[PDB]
């Protein structure tokens, strides 16, 4: 019939009892890092299932014999951090010979290469059965412990190159089991009163600035302002990206000798101004997003042609192409401090990217509809993906797991934003409601109803006390976080509002179309 | 071309290849044939 | 409904049963409803709310469905109750009669700042500034020590920009009139320097009214 | 206690054969009707001194969607009349223009995937990008365009002229 | 005898350069040199002329057992290329 | 003109209040083409069915074949989860701060001149 | 870049602080092991090994699943007694045991017949290597989100007219019930700690080996 | 044994190499093609008179969606 | 307002019952190996009288389908010439001349003694050292399916495979490049 909430709750409790969950949300990173150490090695198994389960009577000495021939010849710069590695390998392989206990194979291995302190070697010579190892009270602890080596990444990269060659699976068994490696890359009451009064701000700190687009064809997708207020980028419907100057510098383009938009038929010879207008024609269909790198050094903009094409500001032409989702891309955004980036597509998933590879790294799946909004946490660790299935998820940039699921919206979600302090989350969409969610409790605490139309974008103030919600009904309302909590309602004299952004000094940038 | 509260079900969808085993787990038409026989005729 | 299916079924060549057209009509409604939903995603996301012909074509292209060709963009195809298209026109006069290649499509961006002269903000009538103005002008400057650090730190945190009166007064009255006196100008520079170290003060468009007095301090 | 104007902003300082062939067709209709009423009442080589041999050229004026469709309607109408037609419907013209518009979009889109694909490799299967795209479309080569033009424009015009000359002699003989 | 360079001059295009050039702008091309944008117009002419010539053949064998183009001369000519058009004539 | 009103109502039911008069006729043409094609698919199935009259099960198979190839939909809720599962073991590269946003290595970028053409 | 070294130095301070000294079955027992096996004899022999056998098997003798591996033209086997015979060269369980992942096939068998072993979702599988006498191998099979996504699927298959919103609410409660703690620090030093502690586990191979 | 993957490459292009990871994908492509054909053939088999046979004649009618024709008897 | 919007039908609800590989063997399915798969999949549908001609048709259909895939992939990396329309036969060298040369135009208009004709094709166009392309990686096949889209008309087969193709994309990063440089500076 009709499913009530109380029987849902007991079903969850029943499942917890089935899986023995009868038995913590903290902010300290010391214990989380301490925990991350615990479960990063708690039963590690990578080649354990694919172990070399072959007879191989004659593999150890021929393999280890190859180690000395390659690692001790024509190498001095990368040898000092790996020469000590050959010492415990003989001892560990000797124990592996004790485990399977051959008759003459173990004796031949020790006798032929006795040259590669002395007390450990002589103890292995006098012991040839596993029972003596258990009764020595010193070699038993040797097997139940690992030899840690603190080597550089280049030395490990040198090691990772050798281990992939032929006849190295047996040696890799010791590495995945026995050796753990490390990689290092007068009352004064008046002053009391003002401290309690001046802190609480009608701040009247709007300082609104408007950028206007004049009479053109009725097509415009997005417009982003550089964080340093040096450039202005916009995306058109007919695969047109135009860059404007906000400081009247009259920048000049540099020669590149390689162009992408030009055919350059075979009848050409390779032979080696103005500003305030420069068309960037690199895409095929409409451009749906445009983001910067927070340093005015590049330009990322996804398009409708299932591709992400990085734009360069040194050669001012298309440089890097990302053939990824193979599906139309909706939203694109950049991580703070220019580390990574991610985007959503029509396959109900969002994929994490990188600046060194042309293919996605992480896969985030579980949505029921196309992902239209995605953002990065200010610490670049968490992601929130919104869709039209009235759900808001929270993902992790490291493991790729959804820790929280937020529901309650009546329709699609068209705007997401992370608070600067990284402890609040905002969400809005077609329900004409502004919602605030707590990242710890996971429950809604405000019901904000100020707009009668769709909400486009959300942007938090640097002080994490004010927020501006751009809408399509020609109204830019700035509300107070720290419908009776509004600072100032802006009357719309234009067609619509595109983007609102706070950088510093409570500066308001509202972009619209005349 | 009608209007009603109920969602019009075509019942002739793209029928993506998937069979129901265990009522919660799904298979892409292969690679779970011999194992299912092995763990169903033995365990139960 | 169901009568429309029967009419075009007759034009196909054979009639259909009454128990078959109901399911066929339901299938048609589902496909058209899904097509509108697919066209909505391309529609409400770029920047627009108006239906266009190309948006429906794009939905068919990405759904492995043949695009409909034959309908333009202008409003045409009237109904006078019946789909007549017998407009026998000659192509001779339609070849070169009136042509013009002028497009006149240019883009221009301008910057203008709106207020939300004297927008009821210059005058101090908020009942929260006169008392604080008195304290900072006669108790934070001059004789009394051991008060600079606490007051300056509190002023560094709060921005409260938008009055534009007081900061100019101290600079004008402290430089153009206290230029021949000591024990005031040193602290006037100290409070001014802390103001430049406040990341929530908009001192962009106010460079001409402050630097000129700065050059007065270094003068003589 | 007043001040100067406080608003700083930067304001940019910115606010032949096809027609002739149709004329010959008109002359034949001018002669066919008279006959119908009378029957019942009885060294070059490419000089590399120019700007065309290189990629130097004047940019094409940008148009909009409304103006582009009208030119498509005009271009389609003229070439169909050159084929031997004199009247046609409106929807039939609209269907042909949309098919041509889709064909041009697919051909232009296919070229773009060809251009940016070789920009990352450096090696080309075919010596020309334009040679390649015809192969997936159906055109054998650019060298087949001269044969198509010769056998559908020059040969048609030479044939079309002879009919006019033959009918002119018929008019001179009858009258 | 003569190379293709001046033979390219001999052609008389019908579609203006502002139509083909706009197509390149949509796909992300400059369309600023005269020489590349003449084959696309010629290719477009060849594609339509073949259909036009095919429609002429159907029209001249209609009922012979002035020239008006109808759907009876369009849906069979478009059938070989894979174009399936079916428009109702009433309601 | 009874189809015009319901089509506008269908668009109204999806939150669209402004449209063009030509899309409504396009959907009517789409509906006509859809049924005409599926009726022809019923004819060939009925002709292959060695039956004089047209049965209703042939339509069910015919519409089944139309949805199999002529409509596109991503695999939901099960296949994308396997993709994340088979890629969950992929680690993350280390962060080495030199100048910030580095670029993919040389060759794997859209910077390469044609071999044939030269200076 | 000056912020990055500050985060790197802060990340280096955090990792050494959590490594040198520490700051009802799952969390409580591992905390006891940290308190017990933390002191060291000041020898360059660190004791952060797997040692899962001493944690539960030799000290509690709890139930476990034994997987048999028979080397050479014969395949592997699984027991509950009542062995099975399945050949190798199949990408069906070699990949599911290739990491800390819980294969779906076991979950179907663990819900109907047996009620023996439940450890907060994770299960322990023992691998036998007769020919490299058998060796002991105790590893943790951490469940993925596929189990909880399919968990509601059995619950949805109840013929009680389940709606989309009711399932979504059940999605959130199940995820929140087995949720993980989150770091809310806006500092970027967490990324360096997270990457270092997740690369030391998976530094082996992606494409090459 | 015979005709694993390399001789089919020689059947088209004498000088062409395939990467190690590409070979398995092609077999899975063939594996999915086999299942799709037999499932559709069985669906037509159950359609003749609720079930008749796996018939080579109805397979020819099935290949119209694949745009292929077998050179077989038919 | 929001209740009038429909919800997409889940294709996952409709599934088939299951009551009771040729992938890791690196083999094309032979006549004997396919027989076991047909009989086991026909029992669920209830079929009898297992014939032999149907098995052969399926095998040849697979052979033709795989040939189409390889023909599509090679055609995006090598040149070819068309004879009387759509027929591709060469799949080989650079016999195609450059159309911007007048010597090629007269040669095109024209169309012991056998060797000179081969020279007119193999030596009238190209570069001094024609470098071959790398072997087909996971990128070339991925782009080949995007452009053509005609080899596999079924969505149930084309879709499930294309995301597996995406997951198999790989290329060496900066770190591995020094190892190649170090090895190259060691043998010299």
Numbering used by the authors:
A (entry chain H): 2 to 24, 34 to 126, 133 to 201, 235 to 250, 253 to 323, 331 to 540, 552 to 583
B (entry chain L): 509 to 552
C (entry chain K): 13 to 93, 100 to 134, 145 to 248
D (entry chain I): 15 to 29, 61 to 87, 129 to 261
E (entry chain O): 116 to 180, 192 to 217
F (entry chain M): 13 to 131
G (entry chain D): 2 to 24, 35 to 91, 99 to 150, 158 to 234
H (entry chain R): 59 to 132
Paper text:
The core module contains nine highly interconnected protein components, among which the histone-fold domains of TAF6L, TAF9, TAF10, TAF12, SUPT3H, SUPT7L, and TADA1 are assembled into an asymmetric histone octamer-like fold. The remainder of the core module, including TAF5L, SUPT20H and the HEAT repeat domain of TAF6L, exhibits an extended and curved organization and intimately contacts the octamer-like region. In the vicinity of the interface between SUPT20H and the octamer-like region, residues 509–552 of ATXN7 from the DUB module meanders through the core module and extends toward an extra EM density that is visible in low-resolution maps of hSAGA. Over the same surface of human TAF6L, an unassigned EM density was found at the similar position where yeast Ada3 is located, suggesting that the unassigned chain might be TADA3 from the HAT module of hSAGA. In contrast with the loose connection of Tra1 to the core module of yeast SAGA, the TRRAP module comes close to the octamer-like region of the core module and makes extensive contacts with the core module components, with a buried surface area of 5000 Å2. TRRAP is primarily tethered by discrete fragments of SUPT20H. Helix α11 of SUPT20H passes through a groove of the FAT domain of TRRAP, and then a C-terminal αβ structure of SUPT20H is snugly nested at the joint region of the three TRRAP domains, strengthening the SUPT20H–TRRAP association. Compared with the organization of Tra1 and Spt3 in yeast SAGA complex, human TRRAP is located away from the TBP-binding pocket of SUPT3H and no longer hinders the path of the TBP-bound DNA. The splicing factors SF3B3 and SF3B5 are associated with the core module of hSAGA complex through the concave surface of the HEAT repeat domain of TAF6L.
